[PDB]
């Protein structure tokens, strides 16, 4: 298959959050069939970022998902042509983010072009005050609608102090060619910043994801 057991990653993200505009570039590697990937991220414009890096990281590719043989792999089937996605992120305090990604491959390496945009984040909330610690692990409900794959997941940021900051993800996954469509299933996620420098200009990011029926 064109998706090899080990695939490299390259990405570029341009965006703006509450007016502050930025550019982040990424280099990485992962095992698509194990559902594990690691990314080395770099802020190229807009350092230091005035908002919590956590809101960006799920925007930094469901091809890195361990899929059982009995579930069609919508994402691995889309290649080499690739796929794109569109995501809305509705936070509980009316903060709101919109993101898109265009994913292709070349050789042993994925490429992403990411756009990220957010606004109406309260000036004293956790995102603008950088009071987030991590994303809790989550479960995304995948299901086919309008000939394309859709995913919904309830997300929550653990805050400094112990409380939680909840967000609603709704994503549309559009393959660039015809692929065998699966029925409803779930993807378990865990995303983690392994290491970072003081202002998060250098960040190392890890995700593990596996698909399964309910």
């Amino acid at each position, epitope marked *: 298959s064109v998706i090899k057991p080990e695939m490299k990653i*390259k990405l*570029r993200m*341009e965006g703006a959050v509450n007016g502050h505009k930025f550019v982040i570039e990424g280099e990485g590697i992962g095992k698509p069939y194990e559902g594990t990937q690691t990314l080395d991220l770099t802020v190229e414009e807009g350092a230091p970022l005035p908002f919590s890096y956590d809101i960006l990281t799920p925007a930094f590719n469901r091809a890195f998902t361990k899929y059982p043989e009995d579930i069609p792999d919508y994402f691995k089937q889309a290649f*080499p*042509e690739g796929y794109s996605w569109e995501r809305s992120m509705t936070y509980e305090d009316q903060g709101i983010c919109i993101a898109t990604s*265009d994913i*292709t491959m*070349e*050789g042993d390496c994925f*490429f992403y*072009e990411i756009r990220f945009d957010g606004t109406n984040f309260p000036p004293n909330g956790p995102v603008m005050q950088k009071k987030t610690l991590k994303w809790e692990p989550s479960t995304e409900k995948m299901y086919v609608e309008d000939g394309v794959l859709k995913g919904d997941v309830e997300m929550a940021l653990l805050l400094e102090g112990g409380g939680h900051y909840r967000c609603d993800f709704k994503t549309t996954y559009k393959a660039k060619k015809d692929v065998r469509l699966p029925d409803a299933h779930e993807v378990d996620h865990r995303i983690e910043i392994l290491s970072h420098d003081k202002d998060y200009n250098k960040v190392r990011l890890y995700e593990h994801a596996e698909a399964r029926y309910s």
Partner: nanobody
Amino acid sequence: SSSQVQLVESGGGLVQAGGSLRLSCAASGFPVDTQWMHWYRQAPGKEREWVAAISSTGRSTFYADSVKGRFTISRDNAKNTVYLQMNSLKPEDTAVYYCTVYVGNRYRGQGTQVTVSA
């Protein structure tokens, strides 16, 4: 197949170290703004080296770490052409340069030669 997509490179030649050179990759058979496109180079004897890449929308550009800062990839959608601007050339940049694209199948140019003198 050559009546489906064609990539035609040009702009190569010989130049002295520290010089400049601007390659062109003229596309035919598909709109250049609908596909990611890459530049490869291949010295004789050694393996091919991925040089640079540009996205469908042209808002993203990627370069190998061996030519960053010096090489620039750009695009003109009206002329349907991808360009590779090469500054501060070094004798190790000596290879045949070609562009490549995937539109249902893999297409590749014939390549233009760049030879850098010491």
